[PDB]
Homo-oligomer: A and B are copies of this chain.
Amino acid sequence: GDQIDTYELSGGARINRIFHERFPFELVKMEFDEKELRREISYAIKNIHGI
């Protein structure tokens, strides 16, 4: 349409697109324990080879 609000954001049309460009942060707020990963990998390797 030709009725455009030039003061605010249009609402869902651009708020939902901001959510879609915000979601990449929720995928990044998570920690990694380097030492626990290395210990678990070492034990996993030794156990997988078995005997």
Contact = CB atoms under 8 A, between A and B. Distances in A.
Contacts of A41: 6
A41 B37 CA distance: 51
B6 A44 contact: yes
Contacts of A6: 39-41, 43-44, 47
A contact patch SS: helix
Interface string A10-38: 10111011000000000000000000000
B43 A7 contact: yes
Contacts of A4: 44, 47-48
Interface of A: 4-10, 12-14, 16-17, 39-41, 43-44, 46-51
